[PDB]
Design a binder for these strands. Structure first.
Ligand SMILES: [Mg+2]
Ligand SMILES: [Mg+2]
Ligand SMILES: [Mg+2]
Ligand SMILES: [Mg+2]
Ligand SMILES: [Mg+2]
Ligand SMILES: [Mg+2]
Ligand SMILES: [Mg+2]
Ligand SMILES: [Mg+2]
Ligand SMILES: [Mg+2]
Ligand SMILES: [Mg+2]
Ligand SMILES: [Mg+2]
Ligand SMILES: [Mg+2]
Ligand SMILES: [Mg+2]
Ligand SMILES: [Mg+2]
Ligand SMILES: [Mg+2]
Ligand SMILES: [Mg+2]
Ligand SMILES: [Mg+2]
Ligand SMILES: [Mg+2]
Ligand SMILES: [Mg+2]
Ligand SMILES: [Mg+2]
Ligand SMILES: [Mg+2]
Ligand SMILES: [Mg+2]
Ligand SMILES: [Mg+2]
Ligand SMILES: [Mg+2]
Ligand SMILES: [Mg+2]
Ligand SMILES: [Mg+2]
Ligand SMILES: [Mg+2]
Lengths: 213, 155, 121, 50, 122, 81
RNA sequence: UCGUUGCGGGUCCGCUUACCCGCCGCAAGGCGGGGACAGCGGCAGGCGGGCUGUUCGGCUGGGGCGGCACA
RNA sequence: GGCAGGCUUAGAACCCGGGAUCCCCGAAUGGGGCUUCCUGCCGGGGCCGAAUAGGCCCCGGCGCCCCGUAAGGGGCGGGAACGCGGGGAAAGGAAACAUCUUAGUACCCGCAGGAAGGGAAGCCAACAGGGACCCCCUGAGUAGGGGCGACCGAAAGGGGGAUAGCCCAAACCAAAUCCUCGCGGGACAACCGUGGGGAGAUGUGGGGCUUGGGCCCGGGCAACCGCCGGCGGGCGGUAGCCGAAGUGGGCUGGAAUGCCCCGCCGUAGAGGGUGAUAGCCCCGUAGGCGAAACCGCCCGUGGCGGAGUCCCGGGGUCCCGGAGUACCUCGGCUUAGUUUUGCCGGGGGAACGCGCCGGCCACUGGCCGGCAAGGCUAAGCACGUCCCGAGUCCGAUAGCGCACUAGUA
């Protein structure tokens, strides 16, 4: 939630001085600054007419059943090269989609070894697209800690939390990794667009059969 | 897993005979007596004890017997006793000035009726709702807007 | 102790408002490969009397002794990285320590040797 | 006034001590950023409420 | 012993604009009883003492008489009294009660092993 | 209690012509305390003390030494001249 | 009118100790007068622009007076 | 960001902990105070002086109301908001306006804490059962109040956060009691021994707390209840330390972090700085380590006191169980409380466990539920001067009035 200070521009000692003085009847400073305008939104230092309010509803709620239908729809899109390529991923070197790797991959602990795994599955070019695609974004976001805009590359889906592969891949540019039970629309359709280049482990695909349904 | 007492929800006239169960405040003295305990011993074992309750439910007795056997055989660890573990009484200053003596308690209504029904409680409760715009205080005149709208839309 | 916050405003406020004992950490410069095998450490705060090689800027490639360190400005003056003003005097270019490499270490100070043993470990 | 109480006189002394501009070396030290003092006043214009 | 004038409190007639409901004087009383007023006046005469309770003693045509009980919470005799400690404060370290309770629980389980476990399983 | 000496044109003239030293002391010092301090510190005899409070809030004492002690000699000995 | 309001005698008389008024006294208490009245609190009726809040309609060959062309 | 002169390797600056100094006014407290300054008495000290006189100066004590035998001790003033008690509007709304609302609000007076208040059934229910309290979600804008208009507005119940239960008085015993000081002992304590003083029969103390108790008899230790916070151990806070990998070739350029080519780390590609845009230059980050001193939390262990106060069974039918209170009436404020909410004031005014109170008008009978008028109580909930983090917030006429020698001139 965002907002202005509740008393902003409203705490000066001001009053309208009426008609007959040859000046507009907006409120003005009472003291030594007298004629200076005050309070009204059209005056310098005046209140903001319709500012943001912290009580504003920002969350767009969704039914649970509807959210889970969308998750299933987004999952299915990861199996189509047309949807994945249209989202912007590099899919030329990927042997097939959905990309399923053996559950042994979940034991890889070092970023160096996970890099080798990505290269031999044809996923490294998309990681390189994200590494080269990081830019300094235009506008005031730089001042607020949003200086860098980074493309998304690969979503790695593992069987469970705390497997070594989570730490081995999470440092790559644009890579997200989740256990299968943590799948969500933020990783499955960045930009609100279906088709994310996804690497499933075989054990993750098995666990998927009892989730989001 | 220390059992939780199961008690019956009071059956109102409004219900028309439909009944349900709920978690109780504590095990009754009758239930504890069937497993050979008093209120003190049961509290020392970490059990919630309700000496006010008169009913004895066999499902509560059965849960107590099962768990006691686990405890007395070293298979279950009782939690900490359900007795006070700290004593924290602060020095009081200006009891008379804040209406905390018996005379103040009487004038505040606390001798004749419940705290929730005293007038100062009503004043504070409604002030909070209006400050936060909670529940029915988000709309002033809500009842009359509903009443007139129902007439027009149900005519 | 330098903020943990990711907000640029708090990162910069930490840097500009840092007390003197924290500003010393900004004086760290990489040791030359030769010194790294002799001492076993990768970085040391630059000190007056050290000899540094300048790696960036107009005086890139110039090696000289550090003559003065300014904790407030986090700048160092190096022999050779100089110029003359209009009145003919010799003045020093203030060089940021992250742009130099230490090639000779001044170890006459016993207190400095403690820092080395800590980092060698 | 001719007949002053000391307490008032010492408040007048404080105002006399503070009524002056920053020294010239302060202007140099701050690269002309500090040139005025808020305590600077003229006896005829800005009145003390002493 | 506190003596005070009985009757309703000194309700003031408002001296500016009011709607008619807010203009009355006679019969309007305070939500405080005279007993609470007596306790408060006593407390002013004995600064630092705590009012424990009070009771009515007598009435006459103009006055009402109360007696107020006050205690000095700084006195060693007062501090350890089981009733007065509720006013003067009381602290028992958690390490004392918890240790005592843990010991009692441990000894009870051993006793119940002998005298109760067979009956439960029988 | 003595803060400094006054070595202005007026003060030096009073030293030579009237055997007086001029000092700045703490504002709460009295004529009795000023005379005691000067005698103890400098081993002279004080004839009388005249005091005033300057418009800048400082107490100034014109201290007249007795007729066996030289104000000019004392200032020279102290090295304040 | 209820309470303050008590004590003797046959609604009446008396009494003083309540209470009230004044004098003296630092206070303690004394003196004199009144006296279960008065005064004071609650309740009730009357007088009550002393003070508080308000209302002083509409149509209308401008408003007002009239009229009611206001049902 | 100046001119000088110094300090610092005998370890400074700086940061953290602990100390020292700390003018006058200020609760301000010897007394004043129309000038943040003046002035008194007593005791001690110094000086001027022939003086021991007299005068001047310095230092300390000297507030009001209280507790306590005294020694001694307490209250006072402040704090951004939050909390408790009391006093208490109008504007506006009702398309006028008075009941009403606004609102028990604004504001005023008093009083607390790190939270406050509440809290342990004279309860709720309906013959089925819940089981202290507060706070959150709901019941619900329902019942109900109301020029039955505007509008106002519960509670029980259900789901959660959290969980905890006790004491004073009295019955019975009758000084077995508490406090203070000296001396000896006792982890610097509690406490023990002894002596003096104070409190105490108008009752200290024991006992007792709905699973009522007192009283009588028997049996049993897993008795029960309380005081001290020493010693050992651990963890945390208040400074910090360690932490991977290019400053590689060429180009442009004042200067590269940019472009081309070639490498490397990654549990670290959060973010910042650096002569233009940096994972690998530096700070940092993932991750790990750390305290002479001060503070906090937890655990183990130690010291001691009581009148058996603890558990179980039997007997009881005797004793105790809270007053201007319950209740009636009149006026008034308030409440959804309505012939029925709470309270204040005036007048009247109980009973006692074989009794008393409640079950939406009163009374009667039945049934059901309880024991007012004494006290305490952790946790779970409010707030933001302050500290930390975050951000579809603003970007110097914006955003706090103040990005700056702003609550300043
Ligand atoms: Mg503004
Ligand atoms: Mg929207
Ligand atoms: Mg732009
Ligand atoms: Mg409402
Ligand atoms: Mg003038
Ligand atoms: Mg009005
Ligand atoms: Mg003079
Ligand atoms: Mg009369
Ligand atoms: Mg009358
Ligand atoms: Mg009028
Ligand atoms: Mg009319
Ligand atoms: Mg008209
Ligand atoms: Mg007419
Ligand atoms: Mg004073
Ligand atoms: Mg206070
Ligand atoms: Mg308004
Ligand atoms: Mg109106
Ligand atoms: Mg009007
Ligand atoms: Mg609390
Ligand atoms: Mg409390
Ligand atoms: Mg209301
Ligand atoms: Mg007793
Ligand atoms: Mg480091
Ligand atoms: Mg590094
Ligand atoms: Mg009772
Ligand atoms: Mg501005
Ligand atoms: Mg601009």
């Amino acid at each position: 939630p965002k907002g202005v200070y509740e008393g902003a521009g409203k705490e000066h000692s001001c009053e309208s001085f009426g008609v007959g003085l040859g000046i507009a009847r907006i409120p003005r400073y009472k003291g030594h600054l007298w004629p200076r305008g005050c309070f009204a939104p059209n005056t310098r230092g005046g209140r903001r007419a319709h500012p943001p309010r912290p009580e504003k509803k920002l969350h767009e709620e969704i039914n649970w059943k509807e959210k889970n239908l969308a998750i299933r729809s987004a999952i299915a899109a990861t199996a189509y090269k047309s949807w994945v390529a249209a989202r912007g991923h590099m899919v030329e070197k990927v042997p097939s989609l959905p990309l399923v790797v053996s559950g042994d991959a979940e034991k890889i602990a070092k970023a160096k070894e996970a890099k080798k795994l990505f290269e031999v599955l044809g996923l490294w070019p998309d990681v390189e697209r994200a590494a080269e695609g990081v830019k300094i974004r235009a506008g005031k976001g730089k001042m607020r800690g949003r200086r860098y805009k980074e493309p998304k590359s690969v979503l790695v889906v593992v069987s469970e939390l705390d497997v070594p592969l989570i730490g081995a891949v999470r440092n790559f540019p644009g890579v997200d990794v989740v256990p299968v039970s943590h799948l969500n629309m933020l990783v499955l359709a960045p930009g609100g667009v279906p088709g994310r280049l996804t690497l499933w482990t075989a054990t993750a695909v098995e666990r998927l059969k009892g989730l989001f349904l | 897993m220390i059992p939780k007492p199961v008690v019956q929800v009071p059956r109102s006239i409004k219900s028309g005979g439909v009944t349900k169960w709920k978690e109780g405040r504590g095990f009754s003295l009758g239930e504890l007596k069937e497993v050979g305990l008093n209120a003190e011993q049961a509290r020392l074992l970490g059990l919630p004890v309700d000496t006010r309750r008169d009913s004895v439910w066999p499902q509560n007795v059965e849960a107590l017997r099962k768990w006691l056997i686990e405890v007395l055989e070293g298979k279950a660890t009782p939690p900490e006793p359900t007795l006070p573990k700290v004593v924290k009484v602060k020095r009081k200053r200006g009891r008379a000035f804040r209406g905390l003596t018996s005379a103040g308690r009487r004038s505040r209504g606390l001798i004749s009726t419940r705290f929730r029904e005293t007038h100062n409680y009503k004043f504070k409760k409604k002030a909070k709702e209006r400050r936060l715009k909670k529940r029915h205080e988000a709309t002033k005149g809500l009842g009359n807007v509903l009443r007139i709208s129902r007439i027009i839309n149900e005519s | 102790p330098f903020t943990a916050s990711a907000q640029p405003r708090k990162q910069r406020l930490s840097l500009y408002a840092a007390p003197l004992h924290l500003r010393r950490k900004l004086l760290n410069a990489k040791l030359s490969p030769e010194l790294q095998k002799k001492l076993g450490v990768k970085r040391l705060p630059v000190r007056r009397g050290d000899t540094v090689l300048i790696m960036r800027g107009d005086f890139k490639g110039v090696t000289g002794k550090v003559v003065k360190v300014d904790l407030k400005r986090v700048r160092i003056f190096v022999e050779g990285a100089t110029r003359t003003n209009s009145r003919g005097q010799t003045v020093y270019y203030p060089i940021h320590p992250s742009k130099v490499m230490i090639v000779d270490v001044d170890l006459s100070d016993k207190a400095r040797q403690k820092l080395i043993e800590r980092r060698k470990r | 006034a001719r007949n002053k109480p000391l307490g008032k006189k010492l408040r007048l002394a404080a105002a006399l001590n503070s009524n002056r501009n920053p020294p010239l070396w302060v202007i140099a030290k701050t690269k002309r950023r500090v040139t005025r003092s808020p305590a600077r006043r003229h006896w005829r214009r800005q009145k003390l409420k002493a | 012993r506190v003596r005070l004038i009985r009757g309703p409190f000194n309700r003031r007639r408002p001296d500016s604009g009011r709607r008619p409901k807010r203009m009355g004087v006679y019969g309007i009383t305070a939500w405080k009883s005279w007993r609470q007023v007596a306790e408060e006046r006593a407390a002013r005469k004995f600064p630092g003492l705590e009012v424990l309770n009070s009771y009515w003693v007598a009435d006459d045509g103009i006055y009402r008489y109360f007696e107020v009980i006050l205690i000095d919470c700084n006195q060693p005799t007062i501090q350890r009294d089981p009733l007065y400690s509720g006013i003067c404060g009381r602290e028992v370290p958690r390490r004392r009660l918890a240790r005592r309770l843990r010991e009692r629980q441990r000894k009870l389980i051993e006793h119940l092993k002998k005298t109760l476990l067979p009956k439960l399983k029988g | 209690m003595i803060k400094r000496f006054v070595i202005t044109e007026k003060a030096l003239r009073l030293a030579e012509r009237e055997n007086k030293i001029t000092i700045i002391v703490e504002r709460t010092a009295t004529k009795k305390q000023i005379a005691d301090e000067v005698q103890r510190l400098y081993n002279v005899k004080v004839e009388k003390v005249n005091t005033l409070i300057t418009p800048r809030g400082e107490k100034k004492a014109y201290v007249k030494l007795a007729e066996g002690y030289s104000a000019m000699d004392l200032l020279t000995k102290l090295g304040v001249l």
